[PDB]
């Protein structure tokens, strides 16, 4: 009666690939801001057919102030024992 | 056993698993390159205190 | 001496004796995990130790400007450039033998003519 | 450059669902493989 929602952990979205990426100061200062990030396209990710090389191409919205091309260095090709989990409040009435 | 533990329930869910770890580094062959270097150099040059 | 570590909890595996087979088995003290030992050695006390003689050799040892240079020939690549340093063991019981590191192949040899 | 690669669009998540919701990183500390789906 206190909570109207299931308290068990949800595994529905567990089967979802995720990439952990560390960004520089200039790039991280604009992508982590909550006054932005409305769903617009920030760029494109290009992967070679044979792999082993990943690059990022941003759009022309940077105001020609930062490089438009970046190299995504895969620090760990195989990663285990890492997961992404969220949390939010529960309904309190009934 | 112990009859009380004082838990705090919350709505949690797994929204993905990490498979690749990446490090973003700007390409050295870009026309805008060497502008970040000046920006980085300005970090040490700055003197916030007065 | 090799210190094997547990597979299930990472704890070190101490030696244990099984009288049923009279063999050497390494077992965990907390999670009851067993493994057959590959060697019969259990303790290695080294009163006179030769370890650490060449400790600190890296891929760019030659870049150190303080290390002296020598013209002795490396007996693996026929090179004349090398840097030499005395034994790194600080106990006052070691000889003044040198150890030469070649700048062309990263090979370590000694100038000693007694034991080599 | 020749089209010898595969490129996909990169778009931001809508902010309407990011309010009152936080995403954290979970790191299992162990030498084995842990999978909550099966293990
Ligand atoms: Zn164990
Ligand atoms: Zn040599």
From Swiss-Prot, chain A:
It comes from the Eukaryota. The modification Phosphoserine is found at residue 6. It is found in: Nucleus. Belongs to the TFIIF beta subunit family. Present with 520 molecules/cell in log phase SD medium. TFIIF is a general transcription initiation factor that binds to RNA polymerase II. Its functions include the recruitment of RNA polymerase II to the promoter bound DNA-TBP-TFIIB complex, decreasing the affinity of RNA polymerase II for non-specific DNA, allowing for the subsequent recruitment of TFIIE and TFIIH, and facilitating RNA polymerase II elongation. TFIIF is composed of three different subunits: TFG1/RAP74, TFG2/RAP30 and TAF14. This is Transcription initiation factor IIF subunit beta. It comes from Saccharomyces cerevisiae (strain ATCC 204508 / S288c) (Baker's yeast). The gene is TFG2. The chain holds residues 51 to 144 of 400 of the full protein.
From Swiss-Prot, chain B:
It is found in: Nucleus. Disulfide bonds: none annotated. Present with 520 molecules/cell in log phase SD medium. TFIIF is a general transcription initiation factor that binds to RNA polymerase II. Its functions include the recruitment of RNA polymerase II to the promoter bound DNA-TBP-TFIIB complex, decreasing the affinity of RNA polymerase II for non-specific DNA, allowing for the subsequent recruitment of TFIIE and TFIIH, and facilitating RNA polymerase II elongation. Belongs to the TFIIF beta subunit family. TFIIF is composed of three different subunits: TFG1/RAP74, TFG2/RAP30 and TAF14. This is Transcription initiation factor IIF subunit beta. The chain holds residues 201 to 250 of 400 of the full protein.
Curated annotation (Swiss-Prot), chain C:
A zinc finger (C4-type) spans 6-31. GO terms for cellular component: nucleolus; nucleus; RNA polymerase II, core complex. One of its GO terms (biological process) is maintenance of transcriptional fidelity during transcription elongation by RNA polymerase II. The modification Phosphoserine is found at residue 39. Pfam families: Zn_ribbon_RPB9 (PF02150), Zn_ribbon_TFIIS (PF01096). It is found in: Nucleus, Nucleolus. SMART domains: RPOL9 (SM00661), ZnF_C2C2 (SM00440). Zn(2+) 2 binds at residues 74, 77, 102, 105. InterPro entries: DNA-dir_RNA_pol-M_15_CS, Rpa12/Rpb9/Rpc10/TFS, Zn_ribbon_RPB9, Zn_ribbon_RPB9_C, Znf_TFIIS. One of its GO terms (molecular function) is nucleic acid binding. Keywords: DNA damage, DNA repair, DNA-directed RNA polymerase, Metal-binding, Nucleus, Phosphoprotein, Transcription, Zinc, Zinc-finger. A zinc finger (TFIIS-type) spans 70-110. Zn(2+) 1 binds at residues 6, 9, 28, 31. Belongs to the archaeal RpoM/eukaryotic RPA12/RPB9/RPC11 RNA polymerase family. Component of the RNA polymerase II (Pol II) complex consisting of 12 subunits. DNA-dependent RNA polymerase catalyzes the transcription of DNA into RNA using the four ribonucleoside triphosphates as substrates. Component of RNA polymerase II which synthesizes mRNA precursors and many functional non-coding RNAs. Pol II is the central component of the basal RNA polymerase II transcription machinery. It is composed of mobile elements that move relative to each other. RPB9 is part of the upper jaw surrounding the central large cleft and thought to grab the incoming DNA template. Involved in the regulation of transcription elongation.
Curated annotation (Swiss-Prot), chain D:
It is found in: Nucleus. Phosphorylated on Ser and other residues by TAF1 and casein kinase II-like kinases. Belongs to the TFIIF alpha subunit family. TFIIF is a general transcription initiation factor that binds to RNA polymerase II. Its functions include the recruitment of RNA polymerase II to the promoter bound DNA-TBP-TFIIB complex, decreasing the affinity of RNA polymerase II for non-specific DNA, allowing for the subsequent recruitment of TFIIE and TFIIH, and facilitating RNA polymerase II elongation. Present with 1920 molecules/cell in log phase SD medium. TFIIF is composed of three different subunits: TFG1/RAP74, TFG2/RAP30 and TAF14. This is Transcription initiation factor IIF subunit alpha. It comes from Saccharomyces cerevisiae (strain ATCC 204508 / S288c). The gene is TFG1.
């Amino acid at each position: 009666k206190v909570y109207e929602e299931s308290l068990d952990l949800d595994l529905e979205r567990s089967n979802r690939q995720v990439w952990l990426v560390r960004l520089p100061m200039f790039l991280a200062e604009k992508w982590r801001d909550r006054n932005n990030l409305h769903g617009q396209e920030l760029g494109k990710i290009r992967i070679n057919k044979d792999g082993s090389k990943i690059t990022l191409l941003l759009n022309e919205n940077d105001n020609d102030s930062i490089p438009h091309e970046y190299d995504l260095e895969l620090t760990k090709k195989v990663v285990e024992n890492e997961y992404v989990f969220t949390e939010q409040n529960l309904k309190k009435y009934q | 056993y112990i009859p009380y533990v004082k838990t705090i329930p919350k709505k949690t869910a797994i929204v993905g698993t990490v498979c690749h770890e990446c490090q973003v580094m700007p390409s050295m062959n870009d026309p805008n390159y060497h502008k970040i270097v000046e920006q980085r150099r300005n970090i040490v040059k700055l003197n916030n205190k007065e | 001496t090799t210190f094997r570590f547990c597979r299930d909890c990472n704890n070190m595996l101490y030696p244990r004796e099984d009288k049923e087979n009279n063999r050497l088995l390494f077992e965990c003290r907390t999670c009851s995990y067993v493994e057959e030992a590959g060697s019969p050695l259990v303790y290695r006390h080294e009163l006179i130790t030769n370890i650490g003689e060449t400790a600190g050799v890296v891929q760019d040892i030659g870049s150190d400007p303080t290390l002296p240079r020598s013209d002795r020939e490396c007996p693996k690549c026929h090179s004349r450039e090398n840097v030499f340093f005395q034994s790194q063991q600080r106990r006052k019981d070691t000889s003044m033998v040198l150890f030469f590191v070649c700048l062309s192949c990263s090979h370590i040899f000694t100038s000693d003519q007694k034991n080599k | 450059d020749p089209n010898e690669y595969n490129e996909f669009p990169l778009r931001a998540i809508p902010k309407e669902d990011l309010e009152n919701m936080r995403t954290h990183l979970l790191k299992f500390q162990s030498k084995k493989k842990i999978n909550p789906v099966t293990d």
